[PDB]
Paper text:
Ferredoxins are small iron–sulfur proteins and key players in essential metabolic pathways. For catalysis, CYPs required electrons typically supplied by redox proteins, such as ferredoxins. Interestingly, two Mtb 3Fe–4S ferredoxins, Fdx and FdxE, are co-located in respective operons with cytochrome P450 (CYP) enzymes suggesting their functional relevance. Here, we explored the genome context for two ferredoxins, Fdx and FdxE, determined the binding kinetics between FdxE and CYP143, and solved three crystal structures: Fdx, CYP143, and a complex FdxE–CYP143.
To visualize structural changes in CYP143 induced by the interaction with FdxE we solved the CYP143 structure alone at similar resolution (1.4 Å). CYP143 structure is conforming to the typical cytochrome P450 fold with 12 α-helices (A–L) and 4 β-sheets. In the absence of the ligand, protein crystallized in open conformation with the heme cofactor accessible to the bulk solvent. The iron of the heme is hexacoordinated by the invariant Cys342 and a water molecule. This water is stabilized by the H-bond with glycerol molecule from a cryoprotectant solution. Superposition of the CYP143 structure with the CYP143 part of the complex structure shows RMSD = .932Å for all atoms and reveals a different position of the lower part of the meander. In the CYP143 structure alone, the meander is away from the K helix, while in the complex it moves closer and sandwiched between helix 2 of FdxE and K helix of CYP. The relocation distance of 5.5 Å is observed for the Gly327 Ca atom. A closer examination of the interacting regions of CYP143 reveals a different side chain conformation of the charged residues involved in intermolecular contacts with Fdx in a complex structure Gln99 of the C helix, and Arg266 of the K helix. The local proximal area involved in the interaction with FdxE is positively charged, despite overall theoretical pI = 6.8.
Numbering used by the authors: 9 to 393
Write the structure that this text describes.
Amino acid sequence: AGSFYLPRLEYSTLPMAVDRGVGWKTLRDAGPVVFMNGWYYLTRREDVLAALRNPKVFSSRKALQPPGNPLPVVPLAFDPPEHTRYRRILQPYFSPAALSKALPSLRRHTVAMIDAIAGRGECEAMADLANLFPFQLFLVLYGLPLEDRDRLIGWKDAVIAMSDRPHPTEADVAAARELLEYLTAMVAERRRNPGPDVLSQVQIGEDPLSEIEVLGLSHLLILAGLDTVTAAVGFSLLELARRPQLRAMLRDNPKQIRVFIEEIVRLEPSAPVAPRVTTEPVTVGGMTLPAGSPVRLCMAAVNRDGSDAMSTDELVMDGKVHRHWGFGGGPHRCLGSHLARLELTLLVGEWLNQIPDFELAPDYAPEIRFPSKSFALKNLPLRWS
Ligand code: HEM
Ligand SMILES: [Cl-]
């Protein structure tokens, strides 16, 4: 029998502020396909992973190519074959082995940021560390002036806040303009005087990227690759603050910190859904969606679906295997997944090395702002002696 009765929920009502497990369970139990505020949400593992793996049918470009004549969103908003070329070009720069060479530098800068905090006996971990750490390391990785961090964070925040909004303010437009001008100058310089950095090297070789391609990639990294890590830092420190024995076991334990970070990305993925638009009719859960349907693939829900011991609502350090789709799946799987793991494991290890014992401030209940453009904690007040 076919499915003619589409479930509908109001997104803003999902019980998501306090516990993402309750929120995703509410959505998952509404059905395999759930219509919320213009989009068809695919909630079940079999459909989500098949859809992520089928770019011909579930297009990223149709969901993510901006209107007007913007910079190309390389590679997020491309489908094969163009996407395949982009990922082939970028893969070597983002591999675990390539990024491992940056580790002494990233570690040095992480230690410095922790140094400035540890003597206070308190911090608000989002404003004081999580919101700053990703851009600091980005400047280090890509060879940008360290003194530009304040301006760049301001620009990033303004651009993220204004995206997909009908009436941008004059301050928003100016911030977008200043960021674009700043990045344009940087890429042009790297094309004329290439160094042994990524943004220089991608513009040289047998198949190089154009200036406009590197400009679009640079914008995408800033808008997509930084706040995601910020969010994950907050959840990492929250769980450590309220689990003393886990904290103690993880200190000076890179093997177990790796596992912990996988659990944080599994359970609180910073981008819990991926948008696509269908290119032809498809049947999911017995229900046929016409061509051109806007869908959202629910990776965070799938990560919690209970189908095995690695997909529960609990933080699970045990078990031989840890696996998940918090970095997505299929060909668009997070280009920066290896960098995110490096940065998060580095932050946890170095935090524990200088601040092994800490706790949540009194009467603090962790929540996200929901609905909003962020799945990050609103704030995270920490205390230590
Ligand atoms: C915990 C941190 C992160 C999470 C949870 C995350 C999550 C994701 C997800 C789910 C996707 C797939 C989106 C889709 O299929 O439409 C994605 C793509 C991407 N991410 Fe991340 N990300 C993180 C960190 C980073 C970092 C650190 C970088 C680089 C600095 C980065 C750069 C990218 C890029 C360029 C893509 C597009 C890849 C493509 O379309 O082929 N991300 N990310
Ligand atoms: Cl406080």
